[PDB]
Amino acid sequence: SMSVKKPKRDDSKDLALCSMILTEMETHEDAWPFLLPVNLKLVPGYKKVIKKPMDFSTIREKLSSGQYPNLETFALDVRLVFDNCETFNEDDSDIGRAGHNMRKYFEKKWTDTFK
Structure with missing residues (x-):
């Protein structure tokens, strides 16, 4: 509260480390559905259904x-990519499987780096 602060967690490397994680996600073989924004002119349903589109290029x-503003808002956008993928794609599709694999991959890097 006012004039009463928890000890300062060192955040000075967060930007570099989120950039490293994001590089790892960009270079994963299963990243291809996520590298660019979904083409809203060419994919029926996407625009109306997916209220907040997100992709790796847009996060980069x-x-x-x-x-x-901080490492949590970065993680929220990464998870949004995977949450959108699950909303639009069957689990037993190539894209659906890709998104589960990538989410697992991310969440491990996230835990190992920051927790």
Whole structure:
């Protein structure tokens, strides 16, 4: 509260480490459904159904331009990618499986790096 603060957790490497994780996600063989924004002109249903589209390129641009205030808002956008994928794609499709695999991959890197 006022003039009463928990000890300062060192956040000075967070930007570098989120960039490393994101590089790892970009280079995973199963990243291909997630590298670019879904083409809203060419994919029926996507625009109406997926209220907040997100992809790795859009997270990379946000990251590079100071649009994440802290490491939790970065994790929220990464999970949004996978949550959108589950909303739109059957679990037993190539894209559906890709998204489960990538979520698992991310959550392990996240835990190992920060927790």
